[PDB]
Amino acid sequence: PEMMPETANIKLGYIPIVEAAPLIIAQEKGFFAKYGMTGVEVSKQANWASARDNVTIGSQGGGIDGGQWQMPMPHLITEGIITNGNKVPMYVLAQLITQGNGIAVAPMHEGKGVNLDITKAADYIKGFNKTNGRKFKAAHTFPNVNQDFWIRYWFAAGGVDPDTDIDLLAVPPAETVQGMRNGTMDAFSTGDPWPYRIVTENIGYMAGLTAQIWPYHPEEYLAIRADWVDKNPKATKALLKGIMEAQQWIDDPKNRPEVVQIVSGRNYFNVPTTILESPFKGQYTMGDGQPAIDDFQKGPLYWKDGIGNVSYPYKSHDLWFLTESIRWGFHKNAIPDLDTAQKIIDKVNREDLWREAATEAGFTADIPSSTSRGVETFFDGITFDPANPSAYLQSLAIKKV
Ligand SMILES: [Ca+2]
């Protein structure tokens, strides 16, 4: 009775990328059912804009109650920043995964130094219009969120202003790939399974994995509408527990072949298992004369990483996402300062529910002791101290603040 979800039903959206694994596995391996959530519908979203629209309308309107998200979408939706003023409060409940993302670059840029650190290739990229007829063109999967941040950080770390020196745009994943094939797209912030296909099919090479840019960086999260969570507190915790067990299950190498088999299935990603087998072993052919990566720790991780617990949603990570938003001058009026960012974070991040669910499920030993993971370090030496985001912003060379 006390654990009995108020409802066993919920519609959770997902995008066909490795970040969705916990949702798919929690469902397919019976982890959701174990806790009473036998009516979970893991619904594939056409794209991020559609996922946003669907959670804004909610399940009662034919959309979704929550699901998988790039950060800080839950916060932006809560504030109605990306919903034309339609504020739909949401709660960030857990981080689904870390890594499993990367930046692909067109083959025409090989031997140019456009790798992890593009410093020496900065002028080349900056003068691409002069030398090649068009501004260097890069793409992400939705503005102002994860992929946009990853590619922006990467560019900026090397001296390339992503807003002024290049054409950074949101472009469908397929179109972008086709663009690189055609010779019109120069790079794109992607993630698995897209990277394997790009290298294998000689479409391009991997300049770097986000695992290299920011080891064990916060990635995508499970977030559900606040009205749903408020009305169904027990069901919410049941979902969290199913997710946690799924994440733990996925991280055991012995289960990864099955994980790959399931998510690649027709009813989910619908892709050849061969393209995900490597990444789930932490194996990536990088290309451009760079050594291949063969490290489980650099592949996608869903439960524990080299720093702490992956699933626990650290508020310090929400803070980085909003701080980086401020860095690029995103939502100038809605999030004009760090204090406002923090206020939004305290309304959105429900790490307390993760703690409670983990405790009830018997994962007390895995619960981080703090809402902050501490000072974060990027591949270029820049550090983000959650206690002083202002210092972080001021340490950055390229920014709009
Ligand atoms: Ca991603």
Curated annotation (Swiss-Prot):
Domain of life: Bacteria
Xref: Pfam families: NMT1_2
InterPro entries: NrtA/CpmA_ABC-bd_dom, TAT_signal
Name listed for the protein in its UniProt record: Bicarbonate-binding protein CmpA
Membrane topology designation: Peripheral membrane protein
Organism: Synechocystis sp. (strain ATCC 27184 / PCC 6803 / Kazusa)
Subunit organization: The complex is composed of two ATP-binding proteins (CmpC and CmpD), a transmembrane protein (CmpB) and a solute-binding protein (CmpA).
Biological process (GO), any one: cellular response to sulfate starvation
PTM characteristics: Predicted to be exported by the Tat system. The position of the signal peptide cleavage has not been experimentally proven.
